[PDB]
Write a protein that holds these residues in place. Structure first.
Motif, PDB file in Angstrom:
ATOM      1  N   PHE A 266       0.647  -1.089   0.074  1.00  0.00           N
ATOM      2  CA  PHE A 266       0.203  -0.077  -0.130  1.00  0.00           C
ATOM      3  C   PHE A 266       0.713   1.312   0.117  1.00  0.00           C
ATOM      4  O   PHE A 266       1.975   1.361   0.722  1.00  0.00           O
ATOM      5  CB  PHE A 266      -1.147   0.085   1.469  1.00  0.00           C
ATOM      6  N   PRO A 267       0.145   2.430  -0.578  1.00  0.00           N
ATOM      7  CA  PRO A 267       1.167   3.477  -0.627  1.00  0.00           C
ATOM      8  C   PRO A 267       1.374   3.952   1.210  1.00  0.00           C
ATOM      9  O   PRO A 267       1.176   4.193   1.959  1.00  0.00           O
ATOM     10  CB  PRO A 267      -0.279   4.598  -1.090  1.00  0.00           C
ATOM     11  N   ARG A 268       3.090   4.691   0.800  1.00  0.00           N
ATOM     12  CA  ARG A 268       3.290   5.520   1.871  1.00  0.00           C
ATOM     13  C   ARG A 268       4.244   6.592   1.378  1.00  0.00           C
ATOM     14  O   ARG A 268       4.560   6.486   0.949  1.00  0.00           O
ATOM     15  CB  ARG A 268       3.929   3.533   2.151  1.00  0.00           C
ATOM     16  N   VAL A 269       4.120   6.778   3.276  1.00  0.00           N
ATOM     17  CA  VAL A 269       5.196   8.450   2.720  1.00  0.00           C
ATOM     18  C   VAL A 269       6.285   7.464   4.324  1.00  0.00           C
ATOM     19  O   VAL A 269       5.755   7.013   5.079  1.00  0.00           O
ATOM     20  CB  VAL A 269       4.425   9.639   3.511  1.00  0.00           C
ATOM     21  N   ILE A 270       7.694   7.524   3.692  1.00  0.00           N
ATOM     22  CA  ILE A 270       8.148   7.018   4.552  1.00  0.00           C
ATOM     23  C   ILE A 270       9.500   8.176   4.969  1.00  0.00           C
ATOM     24  O   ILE A 270       9.503   8.636   4.100  1.00  0.00           O
ATOM     25  CB  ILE A 270       8.649   5.933   3.933  1.00  0.00           C
ATOM     26  N   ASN A 271      10.231   7.785   5.815  1.00  0.00           N
ATOM     27  CA  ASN A 271      11.177   8.926   6.592  1.00  0.00           C
ATOM     28  C   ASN A 271      12.829   8.383   5.136  1.00  0.00           C
ATOM     29  O   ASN A 271      12.500   7.380   5.390  1.00  0.00           O
ATOM     30  CB  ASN A 271      11.555   9.277   7.586  1.00  0.00           C
ATOM     31  N   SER A 272      12.952   9.356   4.945  1.00  0.00           N
ATOM     32  CA  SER A 272      14.212   9.232   4.349  1.00  0.00           C
ATOM     33  C   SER A 272      15.379   8.288   5.095  1.00  0.00           C
ATOM     34  O   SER A 272      15.459   8.225   6.373  1.00  0.00           O
ATOM     35  CB  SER A 272      15.176  10.402   3.366  1.00  0.00           C
ATOM     36  N   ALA A 273      16.294   7.342   4.389  1.00  0.00           N
ATOM     37  CA  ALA A 273      17.809   6.700   6.074  1.00  0.00           C
ATOM     38  C   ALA A 273      17.898   8.423   6.896  1.00  0.00           C
ATOM     39  O   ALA A 273      18.523   7.541   8.117  1.00  0.00           O
ATOM     40  CB  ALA A 273      18.256   6.869   4.322  1.00  0.00           C
ATOM     41  N   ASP A 274      18.353   9.182   5.777  1.00  0.00           N
ATOM     42  CA  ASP A 274      19.265  11.026   7.027  1.00  0.00           C
ATOM     43  C   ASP A 274      18.379  10.989   7.919  1.00  0.00           C
ATOM     44  O   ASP A 274      18.102  12.128   8.177  1.00  0.00           O
ATOM     45  CB  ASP A 274      19.692  11.335   6.416  1.00  0.00           C
ATOM     46  N   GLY A 275      16.629  10.805   7.375  1.00  0.00           N
ATOM     47  CA  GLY A 275      15.740  11.402   8.760  1.00  0.00           C
ATOM     48  C   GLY A 275      15.484  12.964   7.967  1.00  0.00           C
ATOM     49  O   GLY A 275      14.768  13.554   8.703  1.00  0.00           O
ATOM     50  N   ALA A 276      16.412  13.653   7.371  1.00  0.00           N
ATOM     51  CA  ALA A 276      16.050  14.457   6.411  1.00  0.00           C
ATOM     52  C   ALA A 276      14.737  15.165   6.076  1.00  0.00           C
ATOM     53  O   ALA A 276      14.233  16.209   6.031  1.00  0.00           O
ATOM     54  CB  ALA A 276      17.314  14.933   5.606  1.00  0.00           C
ATOM     55  N   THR A 277      14.688  13.866   4.997  1.00  0.00           N
ATOM     56  CA  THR A 277      12.945  14.570   4.509  1.00  0.00           C
ATOM     57  C   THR A 277      11.929  13.277   4.519  1.00  0.00           C
ATOM     58  O   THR A 277      12.645  11.728   4.977  1.00  0.00           O
ATOM     59  CB  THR A 277      13.241  14.764   3.432  1.00  0.00           C
ATOM     60  N   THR A 278      10.937  13.034   3.881  1.00  0.00           N
ATOM     61  CA  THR A 278      10.025  11.658   3.591  1.00  0.00           C
ATOM     62  C   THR A 278      10.079  11.566   1.772  1.00  0.00           C
ATOM     63  O   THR A 278       9.766  12.843   1.582  1.00  0.00           O
ATOM     64  CB  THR A 278       8.882  12.154   4.007  1.00  0.00           C
ATOM     65  N   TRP A 279       9.561  10.458   1.456  1.00  0.00           N
ATOM     66  CA  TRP A 279       9.401   9.966   0.152  1.00  0.00           C
ATOM     67  C   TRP A 279       8.087   9.423   0.021  1.00  0.00           C
ATOM     68  O   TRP A 279       7.930   8.751   0.932  1.00  0.00           O
ATOM     69  CB  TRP A 279      10.762   8.619  -0.173  1.00  0.00           C
ATOM     70  N   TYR A 280       7.879   9.029  -1.183  1.00  0.00           N
ATOM     71  CA  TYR A 280       6.874   8.570  -1.399  1.00  0.00           C
ATOM     72  C   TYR A 280       7.179   7.413  -2.060  1.00  0.00           C
ATOM     73  O   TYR A 280       7.576   6.745  -3.224  1.00  0.00           O
ATOM     74  CB  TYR A 280       5.777   9.353  -2.327  1.00  0.00           C
ATOM     75  N   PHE A 281       5.900   6.009  -1.482  1.00  0.00           N
ATOM     76  CA  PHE A 281       6.117   4.377  -1.953  1.00  0.00           C
ATOM     77  C   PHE A 281       4.253   4.585  -3.213  1.00  0.00           C
ATOM     78  O   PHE A 281       3.517   4.817  -2.002  1.00  0.00           O
ATOM     79  CB  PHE A 281       6.500   3.544  -0.967  1.00  0.00           C
ATOM     80  N   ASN A 282       4.372   4.358  -3.904  1.00  0.00           N
ATOM     81  CA  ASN A 282       3.171   4.208  -4.458  1.00  0.00           C
ATOM     82  C   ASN A 282       3.013   2.486  -4.807  1.00  0.00           C
ATOM     83  O   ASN A 282       3.150   2.619  -6.507  1.00  0.00           O
ATOM     84  CB  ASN A 282       2.788   5.061  -5.630  1.00  0.00           C
ATOM     85  N   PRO A 283       3.044   1.380  -4.412  1.00  0.00           N
ATOM     86  CA  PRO A 283       3.247   0.183  -5.257  1.00  0.00           C
ATOM     87  C   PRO A 283       2.072  -0.323  -6.139  1.00  0.00           C
ATOM     88  O   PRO A 283       0.707   0.316  -5.785  1.00  0.00           O
ATOM     89  CB  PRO A 283       3.516  -0.481  -3.588  1.00  0.00           C
TER      90      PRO A 283
END
Ligand SMILES: [Zn+2]
Ligand SMILES: [Zn+2]
Lengths: 49, 397, 397, 397, 397
Positions: free
Chosen positions: D234-251
């Protein structure tokens, strides 16, 4: 043997002897010499027991 | 066979009740039984192994009985005993394993090994006792014929099956209607989809149905039934039925309408539940039938209305589903389940000793293949083999 | 009652320890106990049935006894015995079943049937024996008014409940905020959604909370807590609270922020866990409270920023969730769980014999209805009925 | 220690086999054992507690024996007995608990408490008896040093771990490739994603791999392997590896291609399965390796083709996954699982009595922390502590 | 096994306490023990060798005792004895060697050879005695279950590892920042370098860290910690990480700033030392963490200022380092160290007799490979094999 007599038998031996199975007896004992060639022939040594 | 059993509860109720401390009398009824054995044995010789990477060790006997030195046992008593048990342990192992590999079509429900064929002999029967181990309890009752029975948590009755059926489709796969499912173990998930959201369907309702035929009857089943099939609630790119192309599934989930679950036995409805989610009981069945519908929402907010246009393209695919899980059940036939190690024990011993594929079991004791074609021969061999695994686990885990 | 028990371990520890072979002195302490029974019986008349589709087979007593000779057992000995047991088997069945249906508002905790009311009689007491079967072990300790206890893998404490609560809504249902959940069995899944992604919320954080009140206290619970509620992570079209229309839920999942799980007992926090996912222990509680937040991401890549505009329409709905599963626990009251067949046995016997709905149990022994209104009367009847089912399963599965 | 055991099966096989009725002879072997105890005790003095909120209690002994006289058992006999048992019950509880909290680095194996250090004494050994309780059965065999073993349903071998690894990423996080997973308890879910749908990949196939190293070897494991990772579908908004931002996952999910599961032991493949979903057996392993691929569909209907353009933006993210669950397995080391209450018992007693954090166990007996750094000391202490919990549960639940 | 031991201290405390002269009574307690042996032996045939270049010498027994008459030993007494010992010497050698090569994955801790499998026999244990040889002292305690323990000097806990990690690098490798180290045996040397001399670093300080995870816990370690890593204080031309080119390292050394050494056990700090050089004690740890910084000198004489410009090229590379050596420590597992000949003995016997690589040990008994993957099987085999080497060295060096 000692461990038997000084404790009565359960026939463990009785059974092994009966279904005629290979077995040994340890310790001192009488002993009887015999020169009768014939004797051997009448498998006497299989008696006594 | 029953013979075999004893040989163990003998040792367990032995390597357990015999410790540096207990009073003799707490084992009088036990010691006896034990000795009796030793006697019957000593003399007769045995062969084990002779297959794949299975060692062929020759076992011979020659042991003295057991003392009694009153008033609780002295350490010295134990050791002179444990040393005699450890030959029976390392023995039985090599015995179980030997008859836990041979199979036979004709009469593969009986003893096979040169080790066991000699055990069923009459001069040995003089041992049998304390048959409370769930499995033997059931082995016997089966030899006379009667209502047997076993207990399983999350049973493994459904051969793996993951597929779909398109009831309405076209080359572009842009307006499909059908069902997709996953039957595996003790669980079933099934979804019914209609790309058109029943726009042209009578009463704006599309009917769905999923039937699953068990290979064995399950009785006294406690089952969880929940609406929705999470497994089929996400976007997918799937291969077409002919494998020539791929279609897109973009589900949006609605509550399943007029849910009806029927647990049938020989075509007869034994249990039926209408829209009842949660825990339900199915007391005796060989078939499960799940019927559910997708009903186009008669009233829709703008956001919803936007998903379901009067004309194609249909971009949001209306989907309804059900999830059914058999938590526990009883079966008259042995089965793999989520708690017992029998299947794993049998499969593991065969794998470890590189046992060649035989004439009865599928390669690798594959569960799906086994349950899919669960013939009488496979079941008799499985039961024999599972019962032996259970005898072995009383001593060796 | 306790009477009843014996009648079985009598037979099991019987139909199990008596086989062609075994040495007598492994059963001396057993044979005895047995006979004692026969005596007490012979000279008594019994009646079972007389309800719905339940036969009314009648029984009389007048039997022989057993030798006390023979070092070992001869086949002939068995058969002349099995034939006498098979009358007690086919008996007890008809006995259990008879008292496994009658319910009583009043003393639903005591004996009912014309069969059992006669068993509690004094002249029968001369039979009790070996009460180690987990259930009887607990029956006694309870009659003596003392601290009970049971074991359950995946218990069934939550009545089925699947719903939502809109904390902010409007006719168009285009900017909602609230929670939706599924409480069922031993599991809880709850999601908190905020269509606005906390755009106008203090600290850009929306707080959520889900409280579940158990009908019975659970102690020594091993629990799995995981972030996310997969069940509420997909697009849905849902009915409005008033049933007048349908709304659209299009979730996008974010990690739940400031997760806090509290296991309370009578309003007091007994265990509290802050953002701890995996396996946690809740040692004694009657309530679970899950608090979690949705925090608008302070930093967003373009793709993320695009999902969360400053103004409506809000097309991607920010959702955070939790999943909690009680793997095992102890309860002072009987409950259905994922392994025991008690509920299924009771429900199955009643269904098979077309037993009419009574004054205590909900129609069909429906679990959700039962646990929702788990009155003292239902619990006493359930325990009586579960204990009998367990006595029966020692012989008949 | 072994001492301790007896003290219980003594009472259980007691508070169970002794009631208003039964013949003496079925307990003769029992009564005896019992008395023997009383003797050894009387005169000796004890002390328990004195740590945290744990009551300090002193106990003495001076009790009568038992009428080895009577044929039957009259009510009066019971009561005069139960009253003497209820001192041993309320005792043992206070005994278990006392040694169920103390930890020690050097000899974390042996006894600790002023209560038990006195039990291992020699003059008390005059008491061992019936060790068929799965746990003691294993305690002993471990002293003699030999292949032990336990039985577990949904075991708890994987410390909680939920993360991802981006094999290809860039600041905008608009064209990522990598894996995300959840390892927890007995389950693993892993997904491999490629935003580009292998558009520029060799053979249009992207390879993925997930390796999980167990802290202890599992043998005889029955495992369910299924395609797809619902948790990452399912679609997710995840924290980046360095914790500085968030990415979008739309599987968007595709079937995992060339699935290969390897169960390795010390680097060697013990079991390997190629694309086999359903139930599989892993007989001995300390590592699981899951390899799977995403293969760009060679043929696509328009709807599918539209999801996967030749150039960015990549808006639908191709994802393939696997789910693996260990239903049951055997381990030579104690572990928490989904059925046993040991961990919960130990954790609960410590929590209830406010026992201070010690030098061996992580705060709160945290399972993840414990299994992550499962040192020999933690295991020896855990086994001691689990064995005591099991002794306690024979009487107190 | 323990058997084996005796056979030696028998001979040593023999070939040593028996010299032309000595008054009998220094050996009365000795002679006896000796004879006892001879008896048990005589009559049993033995076989050794059977692999690689290991002769298959056969052995037999039939020897006269030892006149315990005399008061003062006459030369003639000796010779008639030495001649009987020299058969046991040349024997044991051929015995040790035989079981000092065979290995087993499963029970690779127990006896293997046809020579020893017969020694553990019961009729032989009539010999054991004087177990003061550090190694046997520890073998027993392990078979019994307790805190073992060995003594070392410059132990060999670190597998050889010599590498670097560039935290800041670029193709030209003209402005690097990172660490380089050498972990080997009981020593660690690590240097942190910053070509820019922290010119643009916060507080003009660059932090460094080096973590080393031991494969076994060391207790009671006496350690030397010194500032500077001489090994990394000279000009070097090094291969790039990808092996495609070579970079230049031209160090200039500064004192390490804010040195902190932590000895951790399971993630917990057991010992911590801040800038303490010289001798320090680490009482129990499985991990060492060295943290140190490079601080740009706030005040610089012209000569120093000239080495550190504000802009590239950076020609003098600021470097700070540490050296840590474990002089002595105790380990619960056998290890190679700088004083014991065990590893060398085992390795040497295998090399001399061309023993083929087996399933347990790495080729050539390579220490680095062994300690890198120090599995339980390798440790049990190593301990067995080290204990035998120590038994052998009592007689043959
Ligand atoms: Zn389960
Ligand atoms: Zn030195």
């Amino acid at each position: 043997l000692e461990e038997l007599m000084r404790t009565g038998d359960y026939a463990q031996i009785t059974n092994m002897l009966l279904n005629n199975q290979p077995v040994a007896l340890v310790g001192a004992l009488p002993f009887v010499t015999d020169s009768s060639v014939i004797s051997l022939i009448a498998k006497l040594d299989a008696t006594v027991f | 066979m029953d013979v075999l059993y004893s040989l163990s509860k003998t040792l367990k109720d032995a390597r357990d009740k015999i410790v540096e401390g207990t009073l003799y009398s707490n084992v009088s009824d036990l010691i006896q039984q034990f000795n009796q054995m030793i006697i019957t044995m000593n003399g007769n010789e045995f062969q084990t192994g002779g297959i794949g990477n299975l060692p062929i060790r020759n076992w011979n006997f020659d042991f003295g009985l057991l003392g009694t030195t009153l008033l609780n046992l002295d350490a010295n008593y134990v050791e002179t005993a444990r040393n005699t048990i450890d030959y029976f342990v390392d023995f039985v192992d090599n015995v179980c394993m030997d008859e836990m590999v041979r199979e036979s079509q004709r009469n593969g429900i009986a003893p096979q090994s040169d080790s066991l064929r000699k055990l069923s002999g009459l001069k040995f029967k003089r041992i049998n006792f304390d048959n409370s181990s769930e499995y033997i309890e059931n082995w016997n009752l089966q030899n006379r014929r009667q209502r047997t029975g076993f207990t399983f948590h999350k049973p493994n009755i459904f051969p793996y099956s993951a597929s779909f059926t398109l009831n309405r489709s076209q080359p572009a796969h842009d307006n499909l209607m059908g069902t997709m499912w996953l039957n595996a173990g003790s669980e079933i998930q099934v979804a019914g989809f209609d790309y058109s959201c029943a726009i042209n369907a009578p009463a704006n309702t599309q009917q769905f149905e999923h039937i699953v035929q068990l290979r064995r009857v399950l009785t006294t089943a406690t089952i969880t039934l929940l609406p929705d099939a999470e497994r089929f609630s996400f976007p997918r790119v799937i291969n077409s039925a002919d494998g020539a192309t791929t279609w897109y599934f973009n589900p949006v989930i609605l509550r399943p309408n007029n849910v009806e679950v029927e647990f049938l036995l020989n075509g007869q409805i034994i249990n039926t539940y209408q829209a009842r989610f949660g825990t339900i009981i199915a007391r005796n069945f060989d078939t499960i039938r799940l019927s559910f519908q997708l009903m186009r929402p008669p009233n829709m907010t703008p956001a919803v209305a936007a998903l379901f246009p009067n004309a194609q393209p249909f971009e949001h695919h209306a989907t309804v589903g059900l999830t059914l899980r058999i938590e526990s059940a009883v079966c008259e036939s042995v089965l793999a389940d989520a708690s017992e190690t029998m299947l794993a024990n049998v499969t593991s011993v065969r794998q470890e000793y590189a046992i060649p594929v035989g004439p009865v079991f599928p390669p690798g004791m594959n569960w799906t293949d086994l349950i899919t074609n669960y013939s009488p021969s496979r079941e008799d061999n499985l039961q024999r083999v599972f019962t032996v695994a259970s005898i072995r686990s009383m001593l060796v885990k």
